[PDB]
Nucleic acid binder design. Sequence first.
DNA 1: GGTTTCGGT
Length: 138
Amino acid sequence: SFSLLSQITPHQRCSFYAQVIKTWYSDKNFTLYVTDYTENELFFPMSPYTSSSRWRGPFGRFSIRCILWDEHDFYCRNYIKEGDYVVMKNVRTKIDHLGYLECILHGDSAKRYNMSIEKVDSEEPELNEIKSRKRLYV
DNA sequence: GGTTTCGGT
């Protein structure tokens, strides 16, 4: 089943709804920073004090980086945009070299994992809790 | 696989 982002932990498969705060494409992979406006002690604490940043998102540990490889890259790169809502299913989590919780989509995985990411229509009621919680940090 | 919260490709 789904979990709130505050509820996920390292080294488990999980699924969640989220809003896409930031994207970044490179020759290597496609990266998303997404939030559901819940806090996880393992997320990177985003600083409001950075001179020069376009971060349209919440500050503190409210956002998780997702690294998309291969087909996931090819699919999402010119498709998933900042502001979009996404639903991610059976994705993997780990801890990076700095000890932050991070999400990864490798290739090719396998049919049995049913790992996926797909845009959610912004008018879907499943995104209601995200929208309301967003109002706690505005 | 990759490096570290920018850049804005």
